[PDB]
Write a protein that binds this ligand. Sequence first.
Ligand SMILES: [Fe+3]
Length: 186
Amino acid sequence: EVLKPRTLADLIRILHQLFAGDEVNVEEVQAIMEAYESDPTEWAMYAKFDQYRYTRNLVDQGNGKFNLMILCWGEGHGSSIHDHTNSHCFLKMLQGNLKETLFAWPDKKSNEMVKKSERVLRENQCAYINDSVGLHRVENISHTEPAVSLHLYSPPFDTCHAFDQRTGHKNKVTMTFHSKFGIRTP
Ligand SMILES: [Fe+3]
């Protein structure tokens, strides 16, 4: 009985409704994100790739309540281990596949970081994370094909921490957009 967006525009419209208030039903948002069938004709204008690192491409500013963006992962591209700055974070596959590795949080002592879970996100699958869930690393499973994902953050945030897997030490990182609304932002 899940409401099914027929287009990326439908999905954005529903998201404006679901985040208008003070409560966010995480499983409802997740189901609706997942029910949208990825259509490259609709999102190709955001799919701007870089040779060396994954790119972040803003789709919708969500009337300040959320940010919707598309992340483009070249061959073999992946993230650091990172947190999500106390926001809700939804990530849905649009093309290819990402491996998500969930990590436990370090404490004050220096130590190898500990994996809590490992999975590959399937076609159109929407995953969810927040800081209480854990840290994670996300990476393209493929060295011959790209991956593309649709990320929803609420509230928006533009800083996070990256963690060194060997020690647990972290550095604050400023996140930047490669493009906004289909327009390169260099
Ligand atoms: Fe993440």
